[PDB]
Structure 1
Amino acid sequence: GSVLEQIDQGSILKLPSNLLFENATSDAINQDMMLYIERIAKIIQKLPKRVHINVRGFTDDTPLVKTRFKSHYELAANRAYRVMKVLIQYGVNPNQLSFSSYGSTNPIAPNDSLENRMKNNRVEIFFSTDANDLSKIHSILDNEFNP
């Protein structure tokens, strides 16, 4: 519910930035949230090795002052990287992990309200696989029938 959402090519755990991090321009994780990341790490470790985990950082488009970060892309990158590193510290194999920065792109909801702007400041843990059976079927048929 509040955390889990399904999309057609994988699953998403949505972690609000204001809950996860120390302040609005920080990439340090709140100590009382560390074992929630461990909880996620433990579930990942039980999944098949073929599952990939992409830790995705997003911001809204509120400009930020008095910070070392010079773009929403940089802030989002540092946040996603931090969460990814903690997953590794709690036992997830790095061969299953990547991080992404979306900056202010791909918002959950339009940046048209205070509620929506807060929704857009989040880290998403995206679970998927690199399934290619359909692609391989198509390539074989293409070889045969494409004149």
Structure 2
Amino acid sequence: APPGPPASGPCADLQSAINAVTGGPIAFGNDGASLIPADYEILNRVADKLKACPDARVTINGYTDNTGSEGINIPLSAQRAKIVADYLVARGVAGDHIATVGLGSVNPIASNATPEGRAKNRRVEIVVN
């Protein structure tokens, strides 16, 4: 038997474990689409946690405020998900195990009346699928 506590169900609730690495969803200010080095280290740990259960694919969604238009918010929502996906794949995930979704301005969570609110609704998120 190995040292330390037991390790049963190592992928059985990994949704909660992946959320615990991220501490929740991630925002986009100043430039509105420019991801931080502090997040890219969180993404290193998410990539390793996915790589510990290549049996359990993920899907990555991203959002934008509604000050833009569909022809601007479709590429912006997809780009936020693709930036996370490309970072995870570069750290060690197989491209087969990550999907991406453009949630442009649907199911909004902040008003566009302030630049902070825009960043709070430009959010990106991850879910096991």
User: Do the structures match in fold with TM over 0.5?
Assistant: yes
What does the per-residue CA deviation read over 1:76-109, in whole Å, with 9 as the maximum and x for residues that have no partner?
A: 11121111011000101111111110100122x2
Q: In the aligned structure 2, how far is the partner of 1:112 from the partner of 1:86?
A: 28
- Asked if 1:125 is matched to 2:126, the reply is yes
What does the per-residue CA deviation read over 1:49-83, in whole Å, with 9 as the maximum and x for residues that have no partner?
A: 1x12111111121239xxxx941111111121111
* TM-score of the pair, normalised by structure 2: 0.68
The percentage of aligned residue pairs carrying the same residue is: 25
Count residues in correspondence.
Answer: 110
What amino acid does structure 2 have at the position aligned with 1:111?
Answer: S
What does the per-residue CA deviation read over 1:13-58, in whole Å, with 9 as the maximum and x for residues that have no partner?
A: 511223xxx721x4x4333432221111011111251x12111111
- Asked if 1:23 is matched to 2:34, the reply is no
- Give how far 1:117 is off: 4.2
Q: Is the 8 A contact 2:47 2:93 kept in 1?
A: yes
Stretches (4+) displaced over 4 A = 112-117
Normalized per residue, the structure richer in strand is 1
* TM-score of the pair, normalised by structure 1: 0.61
What secondary structure does 2:26 align onto?
strand
Unaligned runs of 5+ in 2: 1-15
What secondary structure does 2:76 align onto?
helix
What amino acid does structure 1 have at the position aligned with 2:121?
Answer: N
Q: In the aligned structure 2, how far is the partner of 1:94 from the partner of 1:78?
A: 16
Unaligned runs of 5+ in 1: 6-11, 129-147
What amino acid does structure 2 have at the position aligned with 1:43?
Answer: K
Check 1:32–1:119 CA distance in 2 against 1; reply closer, same or farther (3 A cut). Answer: closer
Q: 1:14 aligns with which of 25, 28, 31?
A: 25
Structure 1 match to 2:111: 111
